[PDB]
Structure 1
Amino acid sequence: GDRVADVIESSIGDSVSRALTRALPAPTGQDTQVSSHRLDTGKVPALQAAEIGASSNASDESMIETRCVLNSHSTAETTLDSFFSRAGLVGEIDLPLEGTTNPNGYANWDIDITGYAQMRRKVELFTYMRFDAEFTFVACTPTGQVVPQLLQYMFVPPGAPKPDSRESLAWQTATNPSVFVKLSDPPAQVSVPFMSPASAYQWFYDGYPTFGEHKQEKDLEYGACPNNMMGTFSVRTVGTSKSKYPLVIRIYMRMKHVRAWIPRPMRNQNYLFKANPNYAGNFIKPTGASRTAITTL
């Protein structure tokens, strides 16, 4: 057993996370209390030290003479679900008749929300995000016309066989979930759970997925997180012959039940690649606009 003092009194095993702060309810903005002129020495709220790394806690009352204002402005709309639960474009699938991209009437879209800056800048604000997903698929011809075409959307989890043709055996969907809708119908809409092996999706993974030498050929593996590879999206025109109409499919994603961790600085450079923080080295532009002189507006 334990007989030595350094073991008996040891703090090893204390798994409680000492948290210096606790969350307090704040339905509305903080009220402003009455303040008066204050002329005293020794005590000084105005002078602070950003040196410490803590935001200055000086209030309005401690700097200027303020009145009593009952602030009833709600803080509900700035919450995570209010900010993120708005559907936005995350992927686009093109199904041309004659083309070089997908002339076979099917297309496999690797699920990733980094393909569009509007969504990417929002999601990339936090390092770790845990949420559900709601995907809506708006399909139409390039002219915006709706045509009587029947489509199949298949969810292909990682490891499942990827279809290789419009008549492939993988389309039997005996286990994979599939959605059969027509373009005349309203856009198909399904709810997707949190399927990551990790406890939260991580948009930035500062590491490598496998051991060994990372040479030039094995260099694209940096920044790729297998815990975010949620699978492939397979879409095809349901038929044996080629479809009569060209189709373009836009996939809109809307997060819900969102939880976020570890805020990081928001991107300020043009995006260049999916799952890659690369930026134009010679075209580094300032975050904000510039002015001719500092002493003038």
Structure 2
Amino acid sequence: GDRVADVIESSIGDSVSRALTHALPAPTGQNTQVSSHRLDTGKVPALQAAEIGASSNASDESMIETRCVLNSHSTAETTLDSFFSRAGLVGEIDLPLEGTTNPNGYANWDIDITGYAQMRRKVELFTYMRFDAEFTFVACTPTGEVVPQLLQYMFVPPGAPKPDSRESLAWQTATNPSVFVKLSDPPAQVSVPFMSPASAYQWFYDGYPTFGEHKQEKDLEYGACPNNMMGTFSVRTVGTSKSKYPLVVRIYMRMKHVRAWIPRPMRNQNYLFKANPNYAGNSIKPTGASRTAITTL
């Protein structure tokens, strides 16, 4: 008839993601009901097929005679917010008087959370994460001494003019955020919103960012998603004459309002590079400790 039936019925364009499972509240750990002996045919919880791809549904009440337990153990400590609201080391900026490193009291650091394994592995547990951040900046001398210096931290978002000098014209900061702190003052602390163009940051981009041919030249750009490349970080002296003290700035990141999505296996090999899961091939280590025989402890 009019119109055609295979269009009327057709489920093309179905918007809502059909949920196979809904979330239930679990403030406390699951309580344990009492159990008794059971000698029956057909009811068999212990026997299961791992092939299916599901975890063991067998409950302890059906594997052993159990008592009653009113479990009130809280699960709050095991939440994404209370697991990631831990400030960790994510950057170390050096401003020596004279060395191989930056010698003019201006360092630029393209913002990369990785490069420090402990904060990295914890974060690398998930593939997609969305969060606001709280950055802390600790400044001191290489001995840990506190000296009367005046630094300027400046956030340089992608496309903004990067400082090419200790007294560059970019340090006017007419728009992009910058902070003026003395080393006498306690660590500067700043709250940062989620500013990726995507709905979440990615710790893994299985692809290339550019089109065309991918020869051995542009092969290092594999795994480079600009969506979590949030620009560069710059420090001043401040000018105009060179500083009198050797300086070290350590950046700490705290996550709040966290929302990770899909889970990932957990790194068992030494991190070697930033934004790159390379590993030492001849030095492949087991994920854990090992013993002499399977029949001994």
Confirm or deny a common fold (TM above 0.5): yes
Percent identity, aligned pairs only, is 98
Asked if the contact 1:151/1:236 (under 8 Å) is kept, the reply is yes
Helix, strand or coil at the partner of 1:93: strand
Query: 2-side partners of 1:47 and 1:88: how far apart?
Result: 45
Q: Deviations over 1:202-235 (max 9, x none)?
A: 1000000010111222111101111111010000
How many residues end up aligned between the 2 structures? 297
Query: 1-side partners of 2:284 and 2:261: how far apart?
Result: 28
Query: 2-side partners of 1:214 and 1:10: how far apart?
Result: 41
Structure 1 residues 42 and 159 mapped into 2: Cα distance closer, same or farther (>3 Å)? Answer: same
Query: 2-side partners of 1:168 and 1:213: how far apart?
Result: 38
Helix, strand or coil at the partner of 1:181: strand
How far off its partner does 1:2 sit? Answer: 6.2
Structure 1 residues 85 and 2 mapped into 2: Cα distance closer, same or farther (>3 Å)? Answer: farther
Helix, strand or coil at the partner of 1:130: strand
Asked if the contact 1:2/1:8 (under 8 Å) is kept, the reply is no
Structure 1 residues 136 and 2 mapped into 2: Cα distance closer, same or farther (>3 Å)? Answer: farther
Query: 2-side partners of 1:192 and 1:225: how far apart?
Result: 20
Unaligned regions of 5+ residues in structure 2, if any?
Answer: none
Query: 2-side partners of 1:294 and 1:99: how far apart?
Result: 54
Query: 1-side partners of 2:136 and 2:127: how far apart?
Result: 25
How far off its partner does 1:13 sit? Answer: 1.2
**Equivalent in the alignment of 2:293:** 293
Structure 1 residues 166 and 74 mapped into 2: Cα distance closer, same or farther (>3 Å)? Answer: same
Computed over aligned residues only, the root mean square deviation of the Cα atoms, in angstroms, reads: 0.9
Q: Deviations over 1:34-84 (max 9, x none)?
A: 000111011100101111000011001010000001001000000001100
Q: Which moved more, 1:214-223 or 1:24-33?
A: 214-223
Structure 1 residues 273 and 16 mapped into 2: Cα distance closer, same or farther (>3 Å)? Answer: same
Helix, strand or coil at the partner of 1:77: helix
How far off its partner does 1:127 sit? Answer: 0.2
Query: 1-side partners of 2:253 and 2:246: how far apart?
Result: 23
Query: 2-side partners of 1:10 and 1:201: how far apart?
Result: 36
Query: 1-side partners of 2:200 and 2:280: how far apart?
Result: 30
Helix, strand or coil at the partner of 1:16: coil
How far off its partner does 1:104 sit? Answer: 1.3
How far off its partner does 1:30 sit? Answer: 0.2
Helix, strand or coil at the partner of 2:62: coil
How far off its partner does 1:144 sit? Answer: 0.5
TM-score, normalised to structure 2's length? 0.99
Q: Deviations over 1:90-149 (max 9, x none)?
A: 000000000121011100011111110000001100000000011000010001000000
Asked if the contact 1:87/1:254 (under 8 Å) is kept, the reply is yes
Structure 1 residues 81 and 2 mapped into 2: Cα distance closer, same or farther (>3 Å)? Answer: farther
Query: 1-side partners of 2:243 and 2:171: how far apart?
Result: 17
- Deviation above 3 Å: which 4+ runs of structure 1? none
Helix, strand or coil at the partner of 1:81: helix
